[model samples]
Target: VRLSVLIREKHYSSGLQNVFTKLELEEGIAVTVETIQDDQYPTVLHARLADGTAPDVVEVSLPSLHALDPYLYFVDLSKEAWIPDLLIPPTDPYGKTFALPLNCAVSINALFYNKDLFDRYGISEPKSWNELLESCALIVKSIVPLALSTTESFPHTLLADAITKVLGEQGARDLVKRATDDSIDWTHERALYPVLGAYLELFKRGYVNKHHRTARVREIIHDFTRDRIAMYFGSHLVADAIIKERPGINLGACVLPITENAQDVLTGSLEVQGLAVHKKSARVATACRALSVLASAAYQNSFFEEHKGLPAFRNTTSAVIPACLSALFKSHIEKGKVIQAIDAYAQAQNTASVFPDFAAYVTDPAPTAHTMLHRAQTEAR
Candidate 1:
């Protein structure tokens, strides 16, 4: 029996391959693996499914699952013994589980600053929105104050931060949930305008990087590590990358400041990477065994040890905590300040459903706050 697994080709691919090799499959069963390029994985998976050649098991993002006809292509794993162990359940509205999350609860955009730059310029780590803006003002004159990438994920992070500022943490989640369920008008809510206005305020004040409109995350990282930017809204993985590239850089982490009226909260999501089994596969039993192995506590620890990701399984420990931010991450989770990533809500529609308008707004001639909100009204619903 041949059990095929499709995985995204990423930094962790080699680590994941090592995990697969250790899987205890039956003597007669063999595994075939293919790690497709990250950007091309979805298209490749889609094409394979179209041609009736979908893999028996595959790892996918929440958004990619949203893009696929989940009910049609994926098997329901609701009764799988490992379901209860997932940090975030990947079940749809009907209580049917199609995918198992790879990470227990992944951290997203935390505000990181260059401590050296801050000391040199006498700008302290901000404790409030006003202070944060003040720091931005001081730093902008000498360099780009914030290394904000205008690319795909960064703009959404900014928007999420703005939303959290006005709506509060649960309020933002409620708004997104309502929008996803088609019960609320996205632009009509009083809370939404403030978020939009606040986002535009950052642009108006020239607080973000000048090249943000075209900068990739890597570009922003480059600027941050070289001390060309004072602050960055990125995650521990990014922190890891920067420190690895420039070991001498002094990086400090903080929860991004919230509006004076809002409760302190971080604007990011539980980054969930998931794996699903194909219902139509000839090797359903073998595939299920493979998935079960993938979800086992042993595999989670092994993967985390090699990759430095937070394991998806509860109570599992990995020695590789992301440098300089583990304590902050723990606090955010314990305080319930972390929200599900925006794409999780948008995934109800499809992967590309929520991003195009947001991406368009980040372009050369960006849309006005009201105009963007109005467009969101139609796009979200």
Candidate 2:
């Protein structure tokens, strides 16, 4: 048997594989595993599927990045015992389930800040983009207001954090719809100017770390957890990563406001991830057995324990939300003020593929914003 999964998913996927080992060996059911690289996902995986060489059991996203059309490449799991409890939307694509997105964690982009510092300085969470400028300035006088890490090479993610407010929720959704429907000339999307401009403002205003261009995730984490930095433009997952380094850190998360009067909106994707038995697998029965074990609460509870997120299943009572994100997650989630990550409607690579170009525009001392963005547009996959 063969299983294919993302590199980051290696740990959990291998752990799940462990649960099947003893029984499998007794039946001579050995397996080989392959870790898929994100860069090769859309292109190479498509080639494999067409050539009928895709793995038997593959971890995938439903109606998202996984299988462009789940119904076409994967077996239906609608009749699986856990289908009713599965979360992550488009649950029944065209009214039939081809995959299960159960127990998947949501990833939220946020303005994660130090709650203790905010309380001491009397700076409340900003309600609008203008308010954030004032708050960031005040905090900047005391500590690095924002910590950035371009080493991981994604400083523009901050744009996604506030895109709803900058472009309007409907506008943001429209862009995503159009991009997935076809593609966008990101260079001419003039509306992106302010959103990009606002992010650069943090640097021009001296509100973020001085070494942003070269900083790594470790440096960012250390400065944040040690209280040298007051805030960070990142995701809720940062909360868990920070806490693991400093368990007692008083952390908090909020929307990174970008529009003057727009009521803050949160942006993220309720991970539409799952595992499915490939439609053309040579060992269909073995793959189905593998998926069944992976989907069960028993094995998945370990995943939830390690990775934090809101429960994907209504029947799943154990919630593993990050403490810092608890308040922000609740309010926005209930109000329906959330934007699914672009991957929900567009190619995941379409957005981030140009982040380096956008980051260059912000970091450059010379004038070439037009060329950079256009170059990005031309090369974006």
Candidate 3:
């Protein structure tokens, strides 16, 4: 018997294959794995699916699942016992389960700060929005207060965090839903401006890194390692990478201070990456067995231990949490104060496609916030 699996060319994809290698399969049964660079995977996969050459099982994320046409390409696995264990499973609207989400840890919109810089400047972890600005005000005189990347979706996530802070998690989700459905008019001042205005204020007050307009993720990471920036707004993935790239640097994670409302609590959507079995595969039985192993407690625990994120299975326990990210994971995720990302359910446009417009709104003068919002709304669908 043979099984075929498709995965993005990432380091962890190999780790997934390792799980298969460790599995106790019958003698002479073989599994073949193919990886495509993420840049080319979507288009290539689409072509393969059109020709009926799709793999038996494939790796997918919740947000990307929308593009994959779950009902067409994926098998319905709702009856699988593991489906009940996932923290966030990508559901097909027709009441069929197309994917088994492996794991979801912390939100990517984490605010990483330099403990050394904060202590040196007599600043403490901010509990409110005003305090965050005050800390920036004190640190901006000596070093860049916040390190940011403008060339990618970091700004979009930043914007998402801000919108969530003002609208609250559910409210922000509703707004994105309404925007995508063309139900709300952006011409009027909806709940988003105050948060966006505060974000813009960071630039106006010279609190953001000088290279923010053109900085890439690596540049921001470089600045953080060099002690040139006091705060870095990004994900736990970035924080984990920083720990590996720059050992012994004092770092701590806090929820982004995007809201001043005492009651407002927000986080970036819980992004889920999972595996889906192709419905039309000749080796459905073998493919499902492989998925079972992938979702097993042993595989989930080992993956989380090596990857340093939360495990998907409730029964799997791994204390891989970095001290820097411990608090937010405990307070927000464990407490369930999270909502799905805008692009997760919104059928308007792809999230990455809207980056240029966000860049324009912040960097260029002619595209005002309203104009950028309208453009993003128009382009997403």
Candidate 4:
């Protein structure tokens, strides 16, 4: 039986054809891959699920597997041979596997700088908050220190990183979970003001690009390639864009230096490119066989290479890792200093309102970060 595969248009590429071809050869199941507009992909898919017209297999975020009762709508893949090799927890809160990550969890906004810029400035990766500021002190005279883009969700990523820095990994996870569930009070959260204050300090010290509010990521990438911006917080998995703009561009990355103790420091979010099979499909069994073929180390290594994505499977080989980001993963992720991106977890909707309010803190500092955030959280639900 044939299977229908759905993916967003932005993520579509020739590489998908390779997966489908292998599925046909390995499982004897012909597949039709369809694309929806990128921005509307989730909305469209959600509508399909509500209407009982969802695709047999779909590509989505990991948290999405639990959206509509995983056991009812999604097939259980817990007993699959590949489950043991999966790096991150590919399970729901109930400990059942319904989705598998296609690529390794990656940093939400690990700091990437022009290696040439570092060379010119006589700076290495900053190991502490003081070193980060000191590096900024030297570079601020020449170009924008950080190429921040308020147009996208990096600000939210930044806030989450700061929260992680102050609260530590597991603590921040619990804090976000509590904030989202309305079990904690935000109004008198004074301890957060100082940490949040430090976050806004980037703008106060002029470390960020001045046009941040109006700038888009495209502009910032262009700025970085031209050496007008020294660094940025971005996903290494999408390095294809940088390569597309200017091949062989010198680049280096390190975890954001938010704390004084490098030993206590954690970097950023671990997000995924995941796939799930819909149980309602007539060919659900056949579609699952397709998933097994797709989940193999060979396929993951080959498929996730272009963007320098790390494979989610343990057996996958080296081609998936970006040379510049290797150390960050080695020191942090391999050492267990990683957590899922906020938006990829249950707290996603609760965090959406934070970015704009955060931008407001940048332009107008009259309101304390705690007060602003408290209001944001209050109005979140």
Candidate lDDT values, in order: 0.68, 0.61, 0.66, 0.67
lDDT (10s digit) by residue, model 2, range 142-238:
5777775553323245655555456654576566666555567777777666666666676677776445646766777888887888778765666
Worst 10 residues of 3 by lDDT: 348-357
Flag the better candidate by lDDT, 1 or 2.
1
Q: Which ten residues in a row have the lowest lDDT in candidate 2?
A: 5-14
Model 3 CA deviation exceeding 4 Å by range: 1-4, 7-14, 24-44, 47-55, 91-97, 102-107, 140-142, 154-156, 164-185, 209-211, 260-273, 281-289, 303-311, 314-319, 334-352, 355-381
Two-way TM-score contest, 2 vs 4, winner: 4
Most lDDT-accurate candidate: 1
Model 2, CA-based lDDT: 0.61
Give the candidate order by descending lDDT.
Answer: 1, 4, 3, 2
Each candidate: how many clashes? 4, 0, 4, 0
Q: Deviation in angstroms for 367 in model 4?
A: 5.6
lDDT of 1 by residue, 41-137 (tens): 8899888878879889887666337468878788889899988876556545454668777664565667888899999989999977788889998
Q: What C-alpha lDDT, on a 0 to 100 scale, does residue 252 get in candidate 2?
A: 78
For all predictions, the C-alpha RMSD in Å is 5.8, 6.2, 5.1, 4.8
The collision pairs in model 2 are: none
lDDT of 4 by residue, 152-178 (tens): 343355665666566655565566567
